Amino acid sequence: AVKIKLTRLGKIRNPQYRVAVADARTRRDGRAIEVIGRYHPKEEPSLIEINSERAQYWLSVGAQPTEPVLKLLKITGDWQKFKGLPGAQGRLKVAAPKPSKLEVFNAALAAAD
Amino acid sequence: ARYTGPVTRKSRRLRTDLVGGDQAFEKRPYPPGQHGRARIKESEYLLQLQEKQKARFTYGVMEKQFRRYYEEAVRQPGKTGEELLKILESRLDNVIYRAGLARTRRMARQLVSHGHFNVNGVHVNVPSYRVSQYDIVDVRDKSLNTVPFQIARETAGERPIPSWLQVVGERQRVLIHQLPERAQIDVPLTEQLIVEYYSK
Amino acid sequence: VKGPKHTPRTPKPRGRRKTRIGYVVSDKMQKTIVVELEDRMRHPLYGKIIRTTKKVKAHDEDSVAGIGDRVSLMETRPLSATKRWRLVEILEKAK
Amino acid sequence: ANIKSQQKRNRTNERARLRNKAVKSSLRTAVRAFREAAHAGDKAKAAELLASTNRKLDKAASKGVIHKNQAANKKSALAQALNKL
RNA sequence: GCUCGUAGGUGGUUUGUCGCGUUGUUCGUGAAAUCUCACGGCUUAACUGUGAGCGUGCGGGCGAUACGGGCAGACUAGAGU
RNA sequence: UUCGGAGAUACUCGAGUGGCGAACGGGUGAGUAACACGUGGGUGAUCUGCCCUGCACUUCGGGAUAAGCCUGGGAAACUGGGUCUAAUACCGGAUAGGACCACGGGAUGCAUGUCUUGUGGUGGAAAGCGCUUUAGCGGUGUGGGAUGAGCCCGCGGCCUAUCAGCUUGUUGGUGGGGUGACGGCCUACCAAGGCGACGACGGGUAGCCGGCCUGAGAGGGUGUCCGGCCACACUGGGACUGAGAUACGGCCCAGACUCCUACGGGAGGCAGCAGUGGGGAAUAUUGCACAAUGGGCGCAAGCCUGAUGCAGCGACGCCGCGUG
Ligand SMILES: [Mg+2]
Ligand SMILES: [Mg+2]
Ligand SMILES: [Mg+2]
Ligand SMILES: [Mg+2]
Ligand SMILES: [Mg+2]
Ligand SMILES: [Mg+2]
Ligand SMILES: [Mg+2]
Ligand SMILES: [Mg+2]
Ligand SMILES: [Mg+2]
Ligand SMILES: [Mg+2]
Ligand SMILES: [Mg+2]
Ligand SMILES: [Mg+2]
Ligand SMILES: [Mg+2]
Ligand SMILES: [Mg+2]
Ligand SMILES: [Mg+2]
Ligand SMILES: [Mg+2]
Ligand SMILES: [Mg+2]
Ligand SMILES: [Mg+2]
Ligand SMILES: [Mg+2]
Ligand SMILES: [Mg+2]
Ligand SMILES: [Mg+2]
Ligand SMILES: [Mg+2]
Ligand SMILES: [Mg+2]
Ligand SMILES: [Mg+2]
Ligand SMILES: [Mg+2]
Ligand SMILES: [Mg+2]
Ligand SMILES: [Mg+2]
Ligand SMILES: [Mg+2]
Ligand SMILES: [Mg+2]
Ligand SMILES: [Mg+2]
Ligand SMILES: [Mg+2]
Ligand SMILES: [Mg+2]
Ligand SMILES: [Mg+2]
Ligand SMILES: [Mg+2]
């Protein structure tokens, strides 16, 4: 039936991914019915975005997520707000906010004067 | 590949001293070879070819790499000869020359190539790195107490530092303010003939 | 035990067919009328408005259409091998 | 064959063919018997062999032998032969 | 060689009307990738990710009627008597 | 308990029955000038396993068979017979509207009509297994979604008139048959039509597209990697099973070609991944791994996956750096 799966579309050593709704009778990089997110497993936490009002449409109508996408909808909280679990808030974490490019440059001018 | 040959020989053919000061040039300011003193035929293709050769061997850039610089100079807004010299100037070996950390262009290429420089704490060893705005160009902590780096300390006054970069004190680290437009670029060459060369 | 046992349909707006207006060239086909449509369209290269004609076969529940006859059609299910249209009404008949 | 499951399925494609052919042939020799009573203008057996021919069609459609839109197309045709006699 | 004529292409002045051509605007669609732009990530670059353009079109609704055309008339300068 | 045999009771499990999968994935461009493709619609003319959700239900019985065991035929491939045993296999009943027929209401329109309701008369289903004792997985009829698919139509993309008359189930109607469905799709009679100089009928060639190369653009050439769709699986035809079939690693028949034979008869299809021969100017390893992602089955642990992720090889191409 309808699956929610990942699609490998990066370089050779950089496996980027997209969370895509497709049929089970389809290859990986086929036609997705709708692309709803992305997943980059190379940053230091990760880079995870789920649209969270389209992932509620497809779960309510019968799309079975695969086993590594099921771990992602539990993290962002879109699975718990569909089955009615008390982990409904998102437990995802973003990377550390680095000091920007302008800030380091002004820190170096004051370091000399 | 690099040229790795005589440097005055390609300053004599172009009739223009390319490196900064040379005594082998101005004793023989005519092109080399056994037919060196002959009257050359002033073509229009010769004025356009040799003007492009002034830009390659001043910077040490091969033809398939200099052509890709033209393919994005004509594609950016503004002019074409302006932005060609803009992206040629932002090469990191040209940053070391203008900041007064090297004698000639061929040793500013090695000091980047042998890995004596960081940028954002990132160890670079490519001469064709294009520094953006607000980049710091720092020297390695290991590469102090070194002979070609201590000779660049007391000799920080004889050549002018351009206004688009700034050098600071006991840490010899270069701060890039903006990409240079036209005026602070040194001019041994006119720029509109390189644009007219590729139009052929 | 609480649900309504008949979920009503999601209301779909009724899609429409195409309607066209032509003349009549043939009638002698026993409840089948033949309509010559016309269509004008730019040339893909030279930019001139080109006038081209078609011939379609339509359906009569009652064979009242002479030769002439500004007609009006609407396309249907396949009614025969080559019939795809039906005669809706006749305006300013064969004079 | 070559695959282990394909020898398994060849033995079951022939069990299913002998099963379904006996059911489809029972429908052809029950619609035909209605066509005898309907063509004679009987209205006595034709009113009560219709009730046993349509009941054999619905049982053949629940067993997966014919499709349900095929059973509806054959019951509608035999019933309209009854109402015109 | 020259004329006559069939299909076709083309059409003077003017009033009214329909809004097919034309044109304005809006929703649906024009998959992703490639391509141009702008940033971001591989030490640079090729490569790669994201955002916006592009996709010259086509279908549905609502505006405009100058011009072309369809429909119903009028006029005498072209044409014929 | 012999010292190398007995004991299904018992987790685990060869062969076998049964469910689901095997129609996906992977390859190739021979055929096709066509609704094959691109694009925009139509389906009041349709189908849709597994998945999600609303409502009812999960009820009584019956007869066998594979395996096992004993035997016959054959050189083998394989196959006949007798006994014997189960089920979620199979078959027969009871009750259950979205099956049918007749007659009505209420809503809408785009002509056939469509959806929703009422009465009378006819009908159609199934199945249990497991449990450390709030393990748990299923079965069937139906309203509604989601996905996939079929069919029809408008417009679009080759050369040739030194191919100018093609067509008789051909064009249309009615009554039947057929189909998941409209339809000469098929059949019997009746009418005498249908297409064509805007290129019918024929001949040559060709998979189509997003794209790729060139160009100032308009155009011109092309369809290779990648991605969508179509077509084919030794050649030609044909059905079967199933929700779904060009059924690549299925069945039957005929043909060509290899191979076994005791001469009666049998076996095979790399345009899957590597690989060999051949042709040729010319194109690679009989590699590793299921760690990642996708798929199939199973409650699950898992098993399967030459899809895939990678590596080996060739300056074959782009990009980057060295030889100071
Ligand atoms: Mg190179
Ligand atoms: Mg008819
Ligand atoms: Mg099996
Ligand atoms: Mg019989
Ligand atoms: Mg019927
Ligand atoms: Mg005219
Ligand atoms: Mg006019
Ligand atoms: Mg696109
Ligand atoms: Mg960068
Ligand atoms: Mg990109
Ligand atoms: Mg519009
Ligand atoms: Mg077993
Ligand atoms: Mg099961
Ligand atoms: Mg296949
Ligand atoms: Mg028994
Ligand atoms: Mg009953
Ligand atoms: Mg039963
Ligand atoms: Mg006949
Ligand atoms: Mg009929
Ligand atoms: Mg008929
Ligand atoms: Mg071909
Ligand atoms: Mg040109
Ligand atoms: Mg291809
Ligand atoms: Mg190929
Ligand atoms: Mg072959
Ligand atoms: Mg079937
Ligand atoms: Mg198969
Ligand atoms: Mg094979
Ligand atoms: Mg091969
Ligand atoms: Mg050879
Ligand atoms: Mg795996
Ligand atoms: Mg997996
Ligand atoms: Mg190489
Ligand atoms: Mg070579």
Coordinates of N, CA and C (backbone and C1' of nucleotides) in Angstrom, one line a residue, chain C residues 39 41 52-54, chain E residues 58, chain F residues 35 37-40 153-157:
Chain C
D39 N -12.0 25.4 -36.9 CA -11.1 25.8 -35.9 C -10.0 26.6 -36.5
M41 N -6.2 28.7 -35.7 CA -5.1 28.5 -34.8 C -3.8 29.0 -35.5
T52 N -8.7 25.5 -40.2 CA -8.8 24.1 -40.5 C -10.1 23.6 -40.1
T53 N -10.6 22.5 -40.8 CA -11.9 22.0 -40.5 C -11.8 20.5 -40.1
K54 N -12.8 20.0 -39.4 CA -13.0 18.6 -39.0 C -14.3 18.1 -39.5
Chain E
rC58 P -2.2 27.4 -25.8 O5' -3.1 26.4 -24.9 C5' -3.2 25.0 -25.2 C4' -3.6 24.2 -24.1 C3' -4.9 24.7 -23.4 O3' -6.1 24.3 -24.1 C1' -3.3 24.1 -21.7
Chain F
rC35 P -4.6 5.7 -33.8 O5' -4.2 6.3 -32.4 C5' -4.6 5.6 -31.2 C4' -3.7 5.8 -30.0 C3' -4.1 5.2 -28.7 O3' -2.9 4.9 -28.0 C1' -4.0 7.5 -28.4
rC37 P 1.5 5.6 -23.9 O5' 2.5 6.8 -24.3 C5' 3.9 6.7 -24.0 C4' 4.6 7.9 -24.5 C3' 4.3 9.2 -24.0 O3' 4.9 9.5 -22.7 C1' 4.3 9.4 -26.3
rG38 P 4.2 10.3 -21.6 O5' 4.2 11.8 -22.1 C5' 5.5 12.5 -22.1 C4' 5.3 13.9 -22.7 C3' 4.2 14.7 -22.1 O3' 4.6 15.4 -20.9 C1' 4.0 14.8 -24.4
rU39 P 3.7 15.4 -19.6 O5' 2.5 16.4 -20.1 C5' 2.8 17.8 -20.3 C4' 1.7 18.5 -21.1 C3' 0.3 18.6 -20.5 O3' 0.2 19.6 -19.5 C1' 0.2 17.9 -22.7
rG40 P -0.6 19.3 -18.1 O5' -2.1 19.5 -18.6 C5' -2.6 20.7 -18.9 C4' -4.0 20.7 -19.6 C3' -5.0 20.0 -18.8 O3' -5.6 20.7 -17.8 C1' -5.1 19.3 -21.1
rC153 P -11.0 7.8 -29.3 O5' -11.1 9.3 -29.0 C5' -12.3 10.1 -29.3 C4' -12.2 11.4 -28.7 C3' -11.1 12.4 -29.1 O3' -11.4 12.9 -30.4 C1' -11.3 12.5 -26.8
rG154 P -10.2 13.5 -31.3 O5' -9.8 14.9 -30.7 C5' -10.7 15.9 -30.8 C4' -10.2 17.2 -30.1 C3' -8.9 17.8 -30.6 O3' -9.0 18.5 -31.8 C1' -8.9 17.8 -28.2
rC155 P -8.0 18.3 -33.0 O5' -6.7 18.9 -32.5 C5' -6.5 20.3 -32.5 C4' -5.3 20.8 -31.6 C3' -3.9 20.3 -32.0 O3' -3.4 21.1 -33.1 C1' -4.2 19.9 -29.8
rG156 P -2.4 20.4 -34.1 O5' -1.1 20.0 -33.3 C5' -0.3 21.0 -32.9 C4' 0.9 20.5 -32.0 C3' 1.9 19.6 -32.7 O3' 2.8 20.3 -33.5 C1' 1.3 18.7 -30.6
rG157 P 3.1 19.8 -35.0 O5' 4.3 18.9 -34.9 C5' 5.6 19.4 -34.6 C4' 6.5 18.3 -33.9 C3' 6.9 17.1 -34.8 O3' 8.0 17.5 -35.6 C1' 6.2 16.3 -32.7

